[PDB]
Amino acid sequence: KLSLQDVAELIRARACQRVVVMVGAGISTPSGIPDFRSPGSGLYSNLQQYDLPYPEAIFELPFFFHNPKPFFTLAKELYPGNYKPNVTHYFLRLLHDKGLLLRLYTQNIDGLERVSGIPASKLVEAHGTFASATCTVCQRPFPGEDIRADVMADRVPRCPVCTGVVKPDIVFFGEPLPQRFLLHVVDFPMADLLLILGTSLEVEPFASLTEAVRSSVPRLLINRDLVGPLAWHPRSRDVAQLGDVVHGVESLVELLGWTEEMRDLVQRET
Numbered sequence: 001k002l003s004l005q006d007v008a009e010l011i012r013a014r015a016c017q018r019v020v021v022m023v024g025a026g027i028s029t030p031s032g033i034p035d036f037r038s039p040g041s042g043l044y045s046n047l048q049q050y051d052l053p054y055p056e057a058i059f060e061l062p063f064f065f066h067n068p069k070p071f072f073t074l075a076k077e078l079y080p081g082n083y084k085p086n087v088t089h090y091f092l093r094l095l096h097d098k099g100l101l102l103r104l105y106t107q108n109i110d111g112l113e114r115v116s117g118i119p120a121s122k123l124v125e126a127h128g129t130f131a132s133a134t135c136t137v138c139q140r141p142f143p144g145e146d147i148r149a150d151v152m153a154d155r156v157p158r159c160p161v162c163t164g165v166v167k168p169d170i171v172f173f174g175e176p177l178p179q180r181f182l183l184h185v186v187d188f189p190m191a192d193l194l195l196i197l198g199t200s201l202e203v204e205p206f207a208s209l210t211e212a213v214r215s216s217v218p219r220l221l222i223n224r225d226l227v228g229p230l231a232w233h234p235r236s237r238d239v240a241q242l243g244d245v246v247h248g249v250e251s252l253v254e255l256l257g258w259t260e261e262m263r264d265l266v267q268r269e270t
């Protein structure tokens, strides 16, 4: 059984030099963006105002074509620009500064990973981004910023060529995975450490990427709960730090001896 302390030692020793990271919506709850499924505050449990057939419909395409307003209203509330990265993001940014980060796979659309200053080449935005948009009819692409004013003004963005609804390049249920997701085949066999933070590991194939690392590779889960292959297909070098993601990240940072470097980092960036 490995401990959090053993992981920290591996990193300090550079026995782990190619960290791959998987994150989800739990890493952004501390920044004021709800996750999908936590009781009370989870997105799926507060969508009454939108009078949907069921909660998941607000991120499905066929509902979107029937009525795009509910999604765009929610998207106004979620639109990037003023939310800030938290310590979870800055710790990942610190892995990259210290040359330890192979790749950061994210399910979030909030953009906070980039905002924390991790360069785009190290990121795989597995569920897309607000940075670009696409006409849902004629497939003409647009910079995402060209729909921001419409969104902020409660209007449905329309294509100036064809008048079709223009949608940010967020991956809706059952839409195609983006092309950068295809990097998983190259990254996962090279990982020598896997960190998973703030995700329920419910969606496939994303969740399965946890099994795609070599079985000798330690998998460290920082999350409220024990989830996915860490719960159902455990391996002998798995470590779980359960509880608040920020407290978990801080504990790790302390064992690593990075407390003052983080403080200094979070100061400069903020």
Ligand SMILES: NC(=O)c1ccc[n+]([C@@H]2O[C@H](COP(=O)([O-])OP(=O)(O)OC[C@H]3O[C@@H](n4cnc5c(N)ncnc54)[C@H](O)[C@@H]3O)[C@@H](O)[C@H]2O)c1
Pocket (backbone or CB within 6 Å): 023, 024, 025, 026, 027, 029, 030, 035, 036, 037, 038, 056, 059, 107, 108, 127, 171, 172, 173, 174, 198, 199, 200, 201, 202, 203, 222, 223, 224, 225, 227, 243, 244, 245, 246
């Ligand atoms: N393209 C897609 O697959 C698509 C499209 C639309 C929606 N979704 C949604 O994506 C979801 C999967 O996303 P996810 O894993 O990013 O989010 P989630 O909300 O399913 O999981 C969040 C995890 O973080 C934990 N958590 C939340 N805040 C935390 C905190 N402060 N500290 C510690 N733990 C915390 C929760 O317990 C949970 O395990 C699916 O359930 C689906 O509804 C996916």
Ligand SMILES: NC(=O)[C@H]1CCCc2c1[nH]c1ccc(Cl)cc21
Pocket (backbone or CB within 6 Å): 024, 025, 028, 033, 034, 035, 036, 059, 078, 107, 108, 109, 110, 111, 127, 170, 171, 172, 173
């Ligand atoms: N923090 C996030 O970015 C999360 C939580 C806010 C809504 C959201 C997130 N991920 C998503 C993936 C796809 C779609 Cl359609 C929406 C989301």
Ligand SMILES: [Cl-]
Pocket (backbone or CB within 6 Å): 228, 229, 232, 233
């Ligand atoms: Cl599983």
Ligand code: NA
Pocket (backbone or CB within 6 Å): 204, 207, 208, 209, 211, 229
């Ligand atoms: Na799986």
Ligand SMILES: [Zn+2]
Pocket (backbone or CB within 6 Å): 135, 136, 137, 138, 139, 140, 159, 160, 161, 162, 163, 164
């Ligand atoms: Zn068009």
